[PDB]
Amino acid sequence: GMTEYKLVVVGACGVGKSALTIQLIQNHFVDEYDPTIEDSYRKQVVIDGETCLLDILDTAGQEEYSAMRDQYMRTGEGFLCVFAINNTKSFEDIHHYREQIKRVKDSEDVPMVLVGNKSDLPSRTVDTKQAQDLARSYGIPFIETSAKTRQGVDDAFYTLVREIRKHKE
Numbered sequence: 001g002m003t004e005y006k007l008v009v010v011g012a013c014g015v016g017k018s019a020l021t022i023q024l025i026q027n028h029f030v031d032e033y034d035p036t037i038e039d040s041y042r043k044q045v046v047i048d049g050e051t052c053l054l055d056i057l058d059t060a061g062q063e064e065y066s067a068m069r070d071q072y073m074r075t076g077e078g079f080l081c082v083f084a085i086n087n088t089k090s091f092e093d094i095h096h097y098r099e100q101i102k103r104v105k106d107s108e109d110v111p112m113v114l115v116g117n118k119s120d121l122p123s124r125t126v127d128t129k130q131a132q133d134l135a136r137s138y139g140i141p142f143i144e145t146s147a148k149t150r151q152g153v154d155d156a157f158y159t160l161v162r163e164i165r166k167h168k169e
């Protein structure tokens with residue numbers, strides 16, 4: 001029947017994982033959202049003329065490496081790797097998130113998009129060119145977003161869907 005895309009949103013505390021997912025799926029911006037609340041979000045969408053189902057895990061809570069957690073992340077088809085453009089530590093953590101994706105999927109060829117969120121803010125601390133260079137070194141797209149204004153948000157998620165489609169060929 002209808003194709004379902006299983007996406008996983010990862011990244012450090014406070015980068016906007018929840019805000020991005022709730023904006024895309026529930027059409028509003030949360031000014032704050034408890035960092036322990038983890039949910040799968042679902043919506044039917046049309047992407048490049050294809051009607052499909054998005055099933056998006058907004059990861060939260062604690063870092064942990066039980067076999068069950070590994071296996072749950074293994075079911076993800078594509079990963080949105082989010083940092084905030086005013087949080088250098090969140091950008092420095094991206095390497096770690098990519099390595100865990102590669103470990104559980106046992107592949108360097110996993111659909112992934114690098115997302116620099118909070119683009120609406122002044123006084124960024126992560127240079128866009130440094131982020132582009134990191135994405136270039138991984139061979140993945142890089143997209144700047146604002147969960148607050150929704151600039152780039154749908155583009156970022158739809159780009160990940162397009163990468164999953166491509167990987168299926």
Ligand SMILES: *CCC(=O)N1C[C@H](C)N(c2nc(OC[C@@]34CCCN3C[C@H](F)C4)nc3c(F)c(-c4ccc(F)c5sc(N)c(C#N)c45)c(C(F)(F)F)cc23)C[C@H]1C
Pocket residue numbers: 010011012013014035036059060061062063064065066069070073074093096097100101102104105
């Ligand atoms: C504020 C709470 C929050 O939103 N968090 C995001 C997720 C839930 N957390 C998380 N944290 C880390 O690393 C945190 C940190 C800082 C302390 C030391 N440690 C290492 C680095 F320094 C950064 N890492 C996470 C993950 F790697 C993953 C994850 C991603 C892909 C993957 F295939 C697997 S398999 C598996 N098990 C895990 C785990 N854990 C991953 C995840 C995810 F939810 F599973 F996707 C979360 C990670 C806690 C805080 C930051």
Ligand SMILES: Nc1nc2c(ncn2[C@@H]2O[C@H](COP(=O)(O)OP(=O)(O)O)[C@@H](O)[C@H]2O)c(=O)[nH]1
Pocket residue numbers: 011012013014015016017018019020030031032033034035117118119120121145146147148149
């Ligand atoms: N200005 C601005 N604030 C944001 C944006 N995305 C998230 N936030 C805020 O940043 C804080 C952390 O966001 P949250 O989604 O909880 O981050 P998470 O821990 O990664 O899930 C919250 O106060 C959000 O309202 C954004 O794009 N712009």
Ligand SMILES: [Mg+2]
Pocket residue numbers: 017018019033034035036037059060
């Ligand atoms: Mg959250």
